[PDB]
Design a binder for this molecule. Structure first.
Ligand SMILES: Nc1ccn([C@@H]2O[C@H](COP(=O)(O)OP(=O)(O)O)[C@@H](O)[C@H]2O)c(=O)n1
Ligand SMILES: Nc1ccn([C@@H]2O[C@H](COP(=O)(O)OP(=O)(O)O)[C@@H](O)[C@H]2O)c(=O)n1
Lengths: 221, 225
């Protein structure tokens, strides 16, 4: 089977917070539409799949010229893991070789340009993940974890060390997760060593969860 | 020398962020004043010292009935560490025994009661630090550190990145509001974090740090509630 670069956009219809979140408009285009446009304008994929449980999401995806995979309710529940979602999608279309990229619609400021640049980091030989990430406001080394009562993340001295003396800290932003397809299937997870990062600014890393996020991101445009 | 509980409030007059920040009023009382009030109302200290480099700060502190320590330009510079400022305060008044507490004027919502509660955690036998902290929005284990230009490594486990928050140890970060230490220990260690460090948990709201004009508004809004 020839290798294929597949984009999987998990877009279940219901959302804890904003109802019908994936269909909420931002500048007149649904979140789903924005991510779909990013996938298309990136030109990094041979196949773009939108996986969902509802007819309304399906209809929207189709209008955008991409493929639709219908997820069973069980795989679209609040306790349904995204990894199981992506595995089901790859099995449905029968692909197990190439690359598979998860693109969440909740990261509407992530553009095709972003995806493409993140793709240039993927190493075909090593096959580690390429995950988009953004800088941390509060440095993770200057924290403590409860154990019962608390212990420093690393050293106590870290808590008094100025940023410049400490390593650069970054956190995944959920916009992009690129992996070698066979590796993701074998590992059953999105982070595969050696994981590489694609750095995105705080602005473009906005993640839609509330009505406020929607307006905020609608302004950044 | 008899033991004394000392409160040190480092308040340089100038700020490259918010001009004359420590003198900026919030609901009629300067940031400095709010922190002095918290130190006084806590009733946890035998002495309250405000360390500064300027006359306007000193005058303000005096109006509150507390002691003033004058810092050399070098200890008030933008690179001067807070610990060197506290050491200097203790040396100036001559205290090297009891407890010393740093109370930053930039945490106006940290009250006298907050301080009192934090002190209840201090163990004068073990002599470990008591630092106020608040929960993290983003879990610190769900991060990676840069090693070499374009190479990174996870904080701990690569698997932690995908682990559900509920299944990870609760994380906290010092909020800069309170640091309580045995004085002898602080002087010998020359740092604010001494094992075993206990945390006094505070909410995000009460942990507001003042760095910008907006923070000041948010702080006044929270009070005006
Ligand atoms: N089992 C799942 C889980 C999430 N998702 C989708 O993945 C995206 C991110 O989910 P999320 O709950 O983390 O969104 P936020 O809480 O980050 O705002 C949304 O478009 C969800 O509908 C899905 O299609 N299936
Ligand atoms: N060496 C130092 C460091 C901090 N501080 C005070 O501690 C608080 C927090 O420091 P900061 O770094 O946010 O003050 P800025 O340098 O941002 O103006 C402020 O009230 C400062 O004036 C001080 O008086 N001396």
């Amino acid at each position: 089977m020839e290798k294929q670069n597949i984009a999987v956009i998990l877009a279940r219809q219901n959302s804890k917070g904003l109802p019908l979140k994936n269909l909420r408009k931002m500048n007149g285009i649904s979140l789903l539409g924005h991510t779909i446009n990013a996938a298309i304008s990136s030109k990094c994929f041979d196949r773009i799949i939108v996986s969902t449980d509802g007819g309304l999401i399906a209809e929207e995806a189709k209008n955008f010229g991409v493929e639709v995979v219908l997820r069973p309710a069980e795989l679209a529940s609040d306790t349904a893991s995204s990894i199981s979602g992506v595995i089901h999608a790859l099995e449905t279309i029968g692909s197990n070789s190439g690359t598979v990229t998860l693109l969440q619609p909740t990261s509407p400021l992530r553009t095709g340009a972003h995806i493409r640049e993140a793709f240039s980091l993927f190493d075909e030989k090593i096959k580690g993940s390429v995950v988009s990430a953004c800088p941390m406001e509060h440095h993770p080394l200057k924290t403590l974890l409860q154990i019962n009562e608390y212990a420093p993340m690393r050293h106590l001295s870290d808590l008094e060390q100025p940023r410049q003396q400490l390593p650069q800290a970054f956190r995944p932003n959920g916009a992009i997760y690129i992996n070698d397809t066979a590796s993701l299937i074998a590992n059953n997870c999105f982070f595969i060593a050696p994981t590489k990062l694609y750095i995105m600014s705080h602005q473009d890393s906005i993640d839609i969860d509330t009505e406020l996020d929607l307006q905020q991101a609608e302004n950044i445009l």
